[PDB]
UniProtKB/Swiss-Prot annotation, chain A:
<comment type="function">
    <text>Cytosolic calcium-activated calcium channel that mediates the release of Ca(2+) from the sarcoplasmic reticulum into the cytosol and thereby plays a key role in triggering cardiac muscle contraction. Aberrant channel activation can lead to cardiac arrhythmia. In cardiac myocytes, calcium release is triggered by increased Ca(2+) cytosolic levels due to activation of the L-type calcium channel CACNA1C. The calcium channel activity is modulated by formation of heterotetramers with RYR3. Required for cellular calcium ion homeostasis. Required for embryonic heart development.</text>
</comment>
<comment type="similarity">
    <text>Belongs to the ryanodine receptor (TC 1.A.3.1) family. RYR2 subfamily.</text>
</comment>
<comment type="subunit">
    <text>Homotetramer. Can also form heterotetramers with RYR1 and RYR3. Interacts with FKBP1A and FKBP1B; these interactions may stabilize the channel in its closed state and prevent Ca(2+) leaks. Interacts with CALM and S100A1; these interactions regulate channel activity. Identified in a complex composed of RYR2, FKBP1B, PKA catalytic subunit, PRKAR2A, AKAP6, and the protein phosphatases PP2A and PP1. Interacts directly with FKBP1B, PKA, PP1 and PP2A. Interacts with SELENON. In cardiac muscles, identified in a complex, composed of FSD2, CMYA5 and RYR2.</text>
</comment>
<protein>
    <recommendedName>
        <fullName>Ryanodine receptor 2</fullName>
    </recommendedName>
</protein>
Swiss-Prot record, chain C:
<dbReference type="GO" id="GO:0030018">
    <property type="term" value="C:Z disc"/>
</dbReference>
<dbReference type="GO" id="GO:0005528">
    <property type="term" value="F:FK506 binding"/>
</dbReference>
<feature type="domain" description="PPIase FKBP-type">
    <location>
        <begin position="19"/>
        <end position="107"/>
    </location>
</feature>
<dbReference type="GO" id="GO:0051284">
    <property type="term" value="P:positive regulation of sequestering of calcium ion"/>
</dbReference>
<dbReference type="GO" id="GO:0007204">
    <property type="term" value="P:positive regulation of cytosolic calcium ion concentration"/>
</dbReference>
<dbReference type="InterPro" id="IPR050689">
    <property type="entry name" value="FKBP-type_PPIase"/>
</dbReference>
<dbReference type="GO" id="GO:0010459">
    <property type="term" value="P:negative regulation of heart rate"/>
</dbReference>
UniProtKB/Swiss-Prot annotation, chain D:
<comment type="similarity">
    <text>Belongs to the ryanodine receptor (TC 1.A.3.1) family. RYR2 subfamily.</text>
</comment>
<protein>
    <recommendedName>
        <fullName>Ryanodine receptor 2</fullName>
    </recommendedName>
</protein>
<comment type="function">
    <text>Cytosolic calcium-activated calcium channel that mediates the release of Ca(2+) from the sarcoplasmic reticulum into the cytosol and thereby plays a key role in triggering cardiac muscle contraction. Aberrant channel activation can lead to cardiac arrhythmia. In cardiac myocytes, calcium release is triggered by increased Ca(2+) cytosolic levels due to activation of the L-type calcium channel CACNA1C. The calcium channel activity is modulated by formation of heterotetramers with RYR3. Required for cellular calcium ion homeostasis. Required for embryonic heart development.</text>
</comment>
<comment type="subunit">
    <text>Homotetramer. Can also form heterotetramers with RYR1 and RYR3. Interacts with FKBP1A and FKBP1B; these interactions may stabilize the channel in its closed state and prevent Ca(2+) leaks. Interacts with CALM and S100A1; these interactions regulate channel activity. Identified in a complex composed of RYR2, FKBP1B, PKA catalytic subunit, PRKAR2A, AKAP6, and the protein phosphatases PP2A and PP1. Interacts directly with FKBP1B, PKA, PP1 and PP2A. Interacts with SELENON. In cardiac muscles, identified in a complex, composed of FSD2, CMYA5 and RYR2.</text>
</comment>
<feature type="domain" description="B30.2/SPRY 1">
    <location>
        <begin position="164"/>
        <end position="374"/>
    </location>
</feature>
Length: 186, 263, 107, 434, 592
């Protein structure tokens, strides 16, 4: 029911994807429950993978593999706290190159003929931040003038590190395992 | 087996309600899962409420109560349409707030109560509903800009909080720039008070922000002031009155504490 | 002015005088017979001071003519009651007001 | 047709226009509520795109032009006079379709409802028309629910026109919803529109249904059924007496009811005629009853102030004596032995009268009927007979409820059918002619 | 039940009273009609007194046709008979009136000129007896709202009348007033020319002077001798009585004559000064019929009658107060009990949408309109509707949200506006607040305790329309908040006790009309914080007797509630958790 509500709010036509405390709260429980993170033995490594598959199957069997594609297609290329939380759940359910989730994510896209998803992916990567010399110099002068750095860590150069990393880790996970059916679809 | 706690009772009622039947109300499901999240995150309420906590002495209890009633009388004006009877109410609320000792003694309470944002969104509504058709109720924007300039002058942290809304203040920075006697009572005069004598807040200005004040001044140098030529004033090919008001904001951006910001 | 008709007699010797609050317990009606006010509905005796211009002129004159413990009917002409502007949302313009007033106490 | 060209010479599309105005309405049709969520949202997306594409071509000012050019004729007959008879036959239909299309091209689209702000003054100016009131009201509701920029043009002259529509058209709920959407929109309350609807609708108390809290009124009558008729055996003048043991002036927020007098029946029936079986109606709230309350004479639900020595509302230990004269129709009262300066005349005498008292809660009264049923405190006026002397010899005099049903537990309640007329109450000896 | 017949119906509220159910009906599976009901089933019985209602569009005899006024004509209302000439036709006098009355002046005073026309109060309507309809069977004139006399043979001599004579002390008659409910004339006797009317049907004009009460009649252009003098404020309904001896009987021409104001100008206030005759859709022909039901009251007055003595007489004793809410139709001058709207589906809906407009004109803190709604919906009206168990479901949720909007919408919203903000003074009682009440680390009841955080002030104004002060239009109108607490607690305890048995008579007719309201004034009172200590301790046991125990019954949280009832138990539990976070901020500052 929770996933269906979150997949219906995404399918509802709105001009902008509106901030939703419930969705950023339950996109970090669903994602964090699917990893639960010296040399492990073979049985330990194979048990950490079968538990991973069951924890991932707890969600994509309930429609969570189409929800992370509906919340991205409703973003329309705008970066925010809501796409940086949807891109962490897709990664969580795709970790290890989950073939079932990969097939589910491609079947939905091929069935709905969703053009919004690939237009939002292009807009989210064109809006990703890079290194800035002007901001770094303007911050270096700020520290040089002795004023207290009230802000945390000067996250104006490379404004978003984790969103940019996750947006490409998701695209890598979507093609991991040499998925020749989605490599040719991207 | 025995809950004995509101948190445990609610952590079970929600799940049982959802596992007995499929709820057909999207608003009932949404309120059914917000409350379960609150129980499972009992520390996520103390991270959201404690920032909204402030303590005062017993001597200031009555004065803080008098301030809170005035703040409520202004906050309740955000759900009604701005008019003649909301004119006097808004001005009186702003006057009582600024004629109060707590508003100066405790500037962090004033920032935790979200007073500046309330005043802005009131002014946001006023400008949006009737800006292009000249500024109806111009004694509102004047008071809402006179208060928001004292707010910046109270402390440097209030100025920093006001600086985060510079984009909108520059979006609507042609509100009353040609009407005289409205100087220091203008949305552009609130944008010049968020960087005034603050070196860090002047080193935080972005190039795109400085692109738009220049574009407005360029239009002020190519097109005349239509409101002034409708008033009968001779039609020169440029706007002197509105063009001088985009040159003092830039004066507060390139110059700080008697030294020019070279960036 | 207003004319007063006694419903129940009072003492006939105690009358409201300058500077004295009148505790009245009234019911207000329009000329067509529709009720618009009643202190009995709110269960509050109504307190007002004579000569302070805080109530309508008809009610003031009626209370002045009233006696302690008396119940009487007060007919207020529009001249001594809300005039031609009326009371917005309650009293129609140019309306005659009938009041059933009982003078409970005088302090 | 306006410039008076011959009907045959000009081509007037009537069937094709009607078919197009029926295809467009279905083309701009809101999705049904039983569809799946995805299908509903997809159809909403298509309807919104159609509405947006169907507005940029100036196609909304064309339906308006058609409406304006069709409103130049007062009625279907007026249209059919200038045009053909078949053309006038479907004038109301085309007008009703032009608003159903107009209310669908803008329904749910805030930007389409925002460009219609300049045309609401023209739209309201035709609201009084019977052929267009419903359509104009629907378009107005659709505009006002969606566009916040459309409430800013509505003035006193536009609100008083919508209010005057309820006065001239009846009690329509769809006018109250337009008035409800005029007050609050998207959580924002327009105080100017909230200070006008009240001041222009409420004070009159003539259009909206009005509510009141009224006490229950019960009526007691004795077993006596006395009337007057030609050639009968009955005494034409009678006298009974009522004196009060207790009366609380205000048991509730409303004044305590206590009325005494005479009532009459409809025909020779034993049923109190021309009144309600329950409610707040008492002795004198109809033309079948005549009552006294200590200050007024009640008959037909109109009260007239009557003079009396030390006149007052009925209190504890007050004696009321009632006199009835059926020879010359007359009902007189005497309070505490002093005559009251009022009396009824020339009322209908074709039925059976009886003493009656009506009251709300909080009284204690006692019938003084004469003889063994109560001793008179004051001497009956000369000639008048005590009311206990009208008892039919075998029956027993008893004070009972005027109406059939009383307070009791439901399965024991005696449901009474129609009662036989008391035609034997007036003994008129009529033998055979010989 | 026929003539002089007595009967009794036992629905089966108590199965012990049923004395043949076990003999035949218990084993077969049949159930009593009132097996699970908590209230007495209402009686609806055929109305004895005929009333006036609009002519149905499917009436088997009557057919009203509206004719629009041309340039040379006037608006008209034709009354015809559908089934004339055929068998089963009804040949009896039918009583017709018009839907709207004319009210005379409150105080009687003691080409047409466009000044006299603008200043006059004299109105007109005309009736054209159709040529061929017998004028001896047609009566034209005015009636009042009291006319409820349906007799097969009507004459102008048996109409109900009374003469109220008030005299001075000596007995001299200073005034004599005739009163009646039928001020009408007979067409046959008014007809002067004789026999031949087939020139044109008889035109009997009815002229009323709303400033003096003089009722005159003009037949065929000649004034008749008969006249009436009605009392001030009399509401007269244009009425025509006719026995149909023709296919088309008569008409309601609404034109005008020289120097007389048309009827629509007196009927409608908006058209007061319009000299142009009009027939707006609100004005329709009505007729006296017997097809109506009546609602027997659920409770009657307790009256004690008994012989005290021969020397005393017969004692009548009523002492316990009983009340009902009456709904008044302004255009028909009649009052109807509001509980009769359970079967009137148009008035119920119109009054519900009227209550939704009452709650909309005073929305979001309109205090000047909130005091103006205390003159239309009184406090006793806002307490009878909340408690009455026979109220219609739609009106129960309209009179219920109107109290919460007139009185409790301005302090319940402002207090929520400062709900996520904690300003706790540094006082000597603040320093005594602890996270746990005692050494045993057990949670206290959420809400009960000492809270010192700054809170908005609760201030109200006393409604009064005799006062001329303008300083009461701030703050909401005063309402008794002590009676309301106990009343709401009692109603919610009763609702929990009753609805848990799954009865067939929920208050309002549905479970969503019994609980969705009640939990919304309970929620509003809890938000306002009116409840204190013991009342909260008693209302928490109704939410959950087990969890909130202070030391088979199940609370609201276990009653299988409907979804709309479950949304307000998520708002009630949302504030009960905010009552814990605020304590968890007051207990940190004290340690701090």
């Amino acid at each position: 029911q929770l996933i269906l509500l979150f997949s219906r709010t995404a399918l509802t036509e709105k001009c902008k994807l509106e901030e939703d405390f419930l969705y950023m709260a339950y996109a970090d429980i669903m994602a964090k429950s699917c990893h639960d993170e010296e040399v492990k033995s073979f049985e330990e490594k194979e048990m950490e993978k079968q538990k991973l598959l069951y924890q991932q199957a707890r969600l994509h069997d309930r429609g969570a593999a189409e929800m992370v594609l509906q919340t991205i297609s409703a973003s329309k290329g705008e970066t925010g706290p809501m796409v940086a939380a949807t891109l962490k759940l897709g990664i969580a359910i795709l970790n290890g190159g989950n073939s079932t989730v990969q097939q589910k994510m491609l079947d939905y896209l091929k069935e709905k003929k969703d053009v919004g998803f690939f237009q939002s992916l292009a807009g989210l990567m064109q809006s990703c931040s890079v290194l800035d010399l002007n901001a770094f110099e303007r911050q270096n002068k700020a520290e040089g003038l002795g004023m207290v750095t009230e802000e945390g860590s000067g996250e104006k150069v490379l404004q978003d590190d984790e969103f940019t990393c996750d947006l490409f880790r998701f695209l890598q996970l979507l093609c991991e395992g040499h998925n020749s059916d989605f490599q040719n679809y991207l | 087996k025995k809950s004995s706690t509101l948190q445990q009772l609610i952590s079970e009622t929600m799940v049982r309600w959802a596992q007995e039947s499929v709820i057909e109300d999207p608003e009932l499901v949404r309120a059914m899962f917000v409350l379960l999240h609150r129980q499972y995150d009992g520390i996520g309420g103390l991270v959201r409420a404690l920032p909204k906590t402030y303590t005062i002495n017993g001597v200031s209890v009555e004065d803080t109560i008098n301030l809170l009633a005035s703040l409520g009388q202004i906050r309740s004006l955000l759900s009604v349409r701005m008019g003649k009877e909301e004119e006097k109410l808004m001005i009186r609320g702003l006057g009582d707030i600024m004629n109060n000792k707590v508003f100066y003694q405790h500037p962090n309470l004033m920032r935790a109560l979200g007073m500046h944002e309330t005043v802005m969104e009131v002014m946001v509504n006023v400008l949006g509903g009737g800006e292009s058709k000249e500024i109806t109720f111009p004694k509102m924007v004047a008071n809402c800009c006179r208060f928001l300039c004292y707010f910046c002058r109270i402390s440097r942290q209030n100025q920093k909080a006001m600086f985060d809304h510079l984009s909108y203040l520059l979006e609507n920075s042609s509100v009353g720039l040609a009407s005289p006697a409205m100087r220091g009572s203008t949305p552009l005069d609130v944008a010049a008070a968020s960087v005034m004598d603050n070196n860090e807040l002047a080193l935080a200005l972005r190039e795109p922000d400085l692109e738009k004040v220049v574009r407005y001044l360029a239009g002020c140098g190519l097109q005349s002031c239509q409101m002034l030529v409708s008033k009968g004033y001779p039609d020169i090919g440029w706007n002197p009155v509105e063009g001088e008001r985009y040159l003092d904001f830039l004066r507060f951006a390139v110059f700080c504490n008697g030294e020019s910001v070279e960036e | 002015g207003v004319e007063i008709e006694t419903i129940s007699p009072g003492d006939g010797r105690t009358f409201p005088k300058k500077g004295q609050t009148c505790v009245v317990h009234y019911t207000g009606m329009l000329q067509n017979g529709k009720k618009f006010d009643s202190s009995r509905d709110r269960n509050k005796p109504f307190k007002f001071r004579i000569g302070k211009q805080e109530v309508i002129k008809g009610f003031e004159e009626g209370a002045a003519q009233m006696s302690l413990g008396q119940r009487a009917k007060l007919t207020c002409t529009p001249d001594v009651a809300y005039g031609a502007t009326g009371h917005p949302g309650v009293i129609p313009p140019n309306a005659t007001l009938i009041f059933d007033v009982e003078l409970l106490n005088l302090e | 047709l306006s410039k008076k060209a011959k009907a045959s010479t000009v081509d007037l599309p009537i069937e094709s226009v009607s078919l197009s105005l029926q295809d467009l309405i279905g083309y701009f049709h809101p999705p049904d509520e039983h569809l799946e969520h995805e299908d509903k949202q997809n159809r909403l997306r298509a309807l919104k795109n159609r509405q947006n594409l169907f507005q940029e071509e100036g196609m909304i000012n064309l339906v308006l032009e058609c409406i304006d050019r069709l409103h130049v004729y007062s009625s279907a007959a007026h249209f059919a006079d200038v045009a053909g008879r078949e053309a006038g036959e479907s004038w109301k239909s085309i007008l009703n379709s032009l608003y159903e299309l107009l209310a669908a091209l803008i329904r749910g689209n805030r930007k389409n409802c925002a460009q219609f702000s300049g045309s609401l003054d023209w739209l309201i100016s035709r609201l009084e028309r019977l052929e267009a009131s419903s359509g104009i009201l629907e378009v107005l509701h659709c505009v006002l629910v969606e566009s916040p920029e459309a409430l800013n043009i509505i003035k006193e002259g536009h609100i008083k026109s919508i209010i005057s529509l309820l006065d001239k058209h009846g009690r329509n709920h769809k006018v109250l919803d337009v008035l409800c959407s005029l007050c609050v929109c998207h959580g924002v309350a327009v105080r100017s529109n909230q200070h006008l609807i009240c001041d222009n609708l409420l004070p009159g108390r003539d259009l909206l249904l009005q509510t009141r809290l009224v006490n229950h009124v019960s009526s007691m009558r004795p077993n006596i059924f006395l009337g007057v008729s030609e050639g009968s055996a009955q005494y034409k003048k009678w006298y009974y007496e009522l004196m009060v043991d207790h009366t609380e002036p205000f048991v509730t927020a409303e004044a305590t009811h206590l009325r005494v007098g005479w009532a009459s029946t409809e025909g020779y029936s034993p049923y109190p005629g021309g009144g309600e079986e329950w409610g707040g109606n008492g002795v004198g709230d109809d033309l079948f009853s005549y009552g006294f309350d200590g200050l007024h004479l009640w008959s037909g639900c109109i009260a007239r102030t009557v003079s009396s020595p030390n006149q007052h509302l009925l209190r504890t230990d007050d004696v009321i004596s009632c006199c009835l004269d059926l020879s010359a129709p007359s009902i007189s009262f005497r309070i505490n032995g002093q005559p009251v300066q009022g009396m009824f005349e020339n009322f209908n005498i074709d039925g059976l009268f009886f003493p009656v008292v009506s009251f709300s809660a909080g009284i204690k009264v006692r019938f003084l009927l004469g003889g063994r049923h109560g001793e008179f405190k004051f001497l009956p006026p000369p000639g008048y007979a005590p009311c206990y002397e009208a008892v039919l010899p075998k029956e027993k005099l008893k004070v009972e409820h005027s109406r059939e049903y009383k307070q009791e537990r439901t399965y024991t309640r005696d449901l009474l059918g129609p009662t036989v007329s008391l035609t034997q109450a007036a003994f008129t000896p009529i033998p055979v002619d010989t | 039940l026929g003539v002089a017949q007595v009967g009794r119906m036992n629905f089966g509220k108590d199965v012990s009273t049923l004395k043949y159910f076990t003999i035949c009906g218990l084993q077969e599976g049949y159930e009593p009609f009132a097996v699970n009901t908590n209230r007495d089933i209402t009686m609806w019985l055929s109305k004895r007194l005929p009333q006036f209602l609009q002519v149905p569009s499917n009436h088997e005899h009557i057919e009203v046709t509206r004719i629009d006024g041309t340039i040379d004509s006037s608006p008209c209302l034709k009354v015809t008979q559908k089934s004339f000439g055929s068998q089963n036709s009804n040949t009896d006098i039918m009583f017709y009136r018009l839907s709207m009355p004319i009210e005379c002046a409150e105080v009687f005073s003691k080409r047409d000129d466009y000044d006299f026309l603008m200043q006059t109060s004299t109105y007109y309507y005309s009736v054209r007896i159709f040529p061929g309809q017998e004028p001896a069977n047609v009566w034209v004139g005015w009636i009042t709202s009291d006319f409820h006399q349906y007799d097969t043979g009507f004459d102008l001599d048996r109409v109900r009348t009374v003469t109220v004579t008030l005299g001075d002390e000596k007995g001299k008659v200073h005034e004599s007033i005739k009163r009646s409910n039928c001020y009408m004339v007979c067409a046959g006797e008014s007809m002067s020319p004789g026999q031949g009317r087939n020139n044109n049907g008889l035109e009997i004009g009815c002229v009323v002077d709303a400033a003096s009460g003089l009722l005159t009649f003009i037949a065929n252009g000649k004034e008749l001798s008969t006249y009436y003098q009605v009392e001030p404020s009399t509401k007269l309904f244009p009425a025509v009585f006719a026995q149909a001896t023709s296919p088309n009987v008569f008409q309601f021409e609404l034109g005008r004559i020289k120097n007389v104001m048309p009827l629509s100008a007196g009927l409608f206030k908006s058209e007061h000064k319009n000299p142009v005759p009009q027939c707006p859709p609100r004005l329709h022909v009505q007729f006296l019929s017997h097809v109506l039901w009546s609602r027997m009251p659920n409770q009657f007055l307790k009256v004690d009658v008994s012989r005290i003595s021969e020397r005393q007489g017969w004692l009548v004793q009523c002492l316990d107060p009983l009340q009902f809410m009456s709904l008044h139709i302004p255009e028909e001058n009649r009052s109807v009990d509001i509980l009769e709207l359970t079967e009137q589906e148009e008035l119920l809906k119109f009054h519900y949408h009227t209550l939704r407009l009452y709650s909309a004109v005073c929305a979001l803190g309109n205090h000047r309109v909130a005091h103006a709604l205390c003159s239309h919906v009184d406090e006793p009206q806002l307490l009878y509707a909340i408690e009455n168990k026979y109220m219609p479901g739609l009106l129960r949720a309209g009179y219920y949200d109107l109290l919460i909007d007139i009185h409790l919408s301005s302090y319940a919203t402002a207090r929520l506006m400062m709900n996520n903000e904690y300003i706790v003074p540094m006082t000597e009682e603040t320093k005594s607040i602890t996270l746990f009440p005692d050494e045993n680390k057990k949670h206290g009841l959420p809400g009960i305790g000492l809270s010192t955080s700054l809170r908005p002030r609760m201030q109200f104004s006393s409604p009064s329309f005799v006062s001329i002060s303008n300083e009461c239009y701030q703050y909401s109108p005063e309402f008794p908040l002590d009676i309301l607490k106990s009343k709401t607690i009692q109603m919610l305890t009763e609702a929990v006790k009753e609805g848990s048995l799954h009865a067939r008579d929920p208050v309002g007719g549905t479970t969503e009309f019994l609980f969705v309201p009640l939990i919304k004034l309970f929620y509003t009172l809890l938000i306002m914080g009116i409840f204190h200590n013991e009342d909260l301790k008693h209302i928490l046991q109704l939410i959950e007797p087990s969890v909130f125990k202070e030391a088979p019954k199940e609370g609201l949280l276990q009653m299988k509630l409907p979804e709309p009832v479950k949304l307000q138990m998520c708002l009630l539990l949302q504030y009960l958790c905010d009552c814990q976070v605020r304590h968890r901020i007051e207990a940190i500052v004290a340690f701090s």
